[PDB]
């Protein structure tokens, strides 16, 4: 049950300034020292930052040194990175990640979060506006109905959504999301359900927007 | 450019063995036994594979085996299997309590047969007319390979702009999905008897058409 969750990713303007954290549990934190791990959009890892268990031994490489912080509180399970001076190249995605245990694994990352998406850009915040696409009489296959939400003008990434709060898996593809002129993104969820289900079950896709503080649940009906 | 050199792909079909390479230097990989490679699938957090050059952790089966040469480590899988499908990035240890990366390799499963789209045709909602704005949806889904064109019909004309189409993704049955978006006015929405989505597979067409009324 070791778990790490990064949570602070947002927009921010290039030489402004954006704190992250990771909660970990499941593990003897204050035992473990510490990482931030970041990935540019198509890039491969690049190690940030380690802090020991102390807060003593603290390491930085040289794309960021003197620029981001690192730290940790122990009494919370939480670790830290304060970045400033940030520019379009810090955009990515920043992991979590323990060095595993001294002496049997060292330089090894054996565990990591999910991570959390910062992007810098002087381009302004937008929450999506959400769409039903309605099954009908011409979007079944007998019996199999596909039905969708429509998520629209987004920035940045990302958006996350599922079907009926995750109950609504096994017919569900969510896209990619398109880029359009407007610097805005787009993107659309599916799910196929039953035609018969459709006078009794509701169906709702849960679309959140982290940076613009979005949650929407949008009720697709027939 | 990453630090360690790994190729951006690789590939085999399932039952074979693929080896991925990671070239770095005397500073790094030939620098010490300190390799390892982690597993990433999509919005995933990466996996820790192999370790030391060749030690795996527990749980990590072993058909994943690494090895190295020099200044060049190598992680093999063999018997591949498609959940094996993922990106491999190798990492080592550079001195200076540095630890670098390889800049990733996309692991593609084949052997999947020939598989035909199927095509659903959205209209624009009556909440996004409202909003002064009209987007028909174009969903692809089911197909192999990875590979289409979509087309968009006013009528019979060809549209001569608003089109946005996605790269094919893999679905969760490891079979291909993509979409196209038209983006309209509502006046032109109004003003034409259908509109229509055509997606090219493999020399086939699927063409499904949506009208106003
Ligand atoms: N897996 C690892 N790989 C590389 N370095 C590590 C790893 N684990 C810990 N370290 C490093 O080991 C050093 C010791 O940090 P640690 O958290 O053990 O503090 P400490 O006070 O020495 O520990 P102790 O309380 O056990 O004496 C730090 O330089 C830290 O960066």
């Known amino acids: 049950q070791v778990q790490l969750q990064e949570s602070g990713g947002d927009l921010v303007k290039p030489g402004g300034s954006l704190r992250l954290s990771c909660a970990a549990s499941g593990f003897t934190f204050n035992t473990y020292t510490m990482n931030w791990v970041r990935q540019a959009p198509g890039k491969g890892l690049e190690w940030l930052s380690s802090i020991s268990s102390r807060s003593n031994y603290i390491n930085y490489a040289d794309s960021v040194k003197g620029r981001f912080t690192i730290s940790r509180d122990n009494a919370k399970n939480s670790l830290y990175l304060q970045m400033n001076s940030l520019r379009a190249e810090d955009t990515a995605v920043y992991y979590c990640?323990?060095?595993?245990?001294?002496?049997?694994?060292?330089?090894?990352?054996?565990?990591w979060g999910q991570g959390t998406l910062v992007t810098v850009s002087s381009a302004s915040t937008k929450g999506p506006s959400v769409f039903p696409l309605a099954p009908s009489s011409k979007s079944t296959s007998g019996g199999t109905a596909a039905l969708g939400c429509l998520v629209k003008d987004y920035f940045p990434e990302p958006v996350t959504v599922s079907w009926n709060s995750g109950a609504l898996t096994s017919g569900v593809h969510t896209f990619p999301a398109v880029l359009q002129s407007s610097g805005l993104y787009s993107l659309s969820s599916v799910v196929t359900v039953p035609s018969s289900s459709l006078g009794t079950q509701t169906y709702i896709c849960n679309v959140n927007h982290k940076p613009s503080n979005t949650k929407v649940d949008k009720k697709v009906e027939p | 450019q990453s630090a360690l050199t790994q190729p951006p792909s690789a590939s085999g079909s399932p039952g074979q063995s693929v080896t991925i390479s990671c070239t770095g230097t005397?500073?790094?990989?030939?620098?010490?036994?300190?390799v390892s490679w982690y597993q990433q699938h999509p919005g995933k957090a990466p996996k820790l594979m192999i370790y030391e050059v060749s030690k795996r952790p527990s749980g990590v089966p072993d058909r994943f085996s690494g090895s190295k040469s020099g200044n060049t480590a190598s992680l093999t899988v063999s018997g591949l299997q498609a959940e094996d499908e993922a990106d491999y990035f190798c990492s080592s240890y550079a001195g200076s309590n540095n630890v670098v990366f390889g800049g990733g390799t996309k692991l593609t499963v084949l052997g999947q047969p020939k598989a035909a789209p199927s095509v659903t045709l959205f209209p624009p909602s009556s909440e996004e007319l409202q909003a002064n704005k009209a987007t028909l949806v174009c969903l692809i889904s089911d197909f192999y390979p990875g590979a289409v064109t979509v087309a968009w019909k006013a009528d019979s004309s060809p549209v001569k702009a608003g089109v946005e189409t996605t790269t094919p993704s893999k679905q969760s049955n490891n079979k291909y999905a993509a979409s196209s978006y038209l983006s309209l006015t509502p006046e032109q929405w109004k003003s034409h008897r259908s509109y229509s989505c055509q997606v090219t597979h493999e020399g086939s067409t699927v063409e499904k058409t949506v009208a106003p009324t």
């Open positions: 990640a323990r060095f595993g245990r001294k002496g049997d694994l060292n330089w090894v990352f054996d565990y």
């Open positions: 005397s500073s790094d990989v030939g620098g010490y036994n300190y």
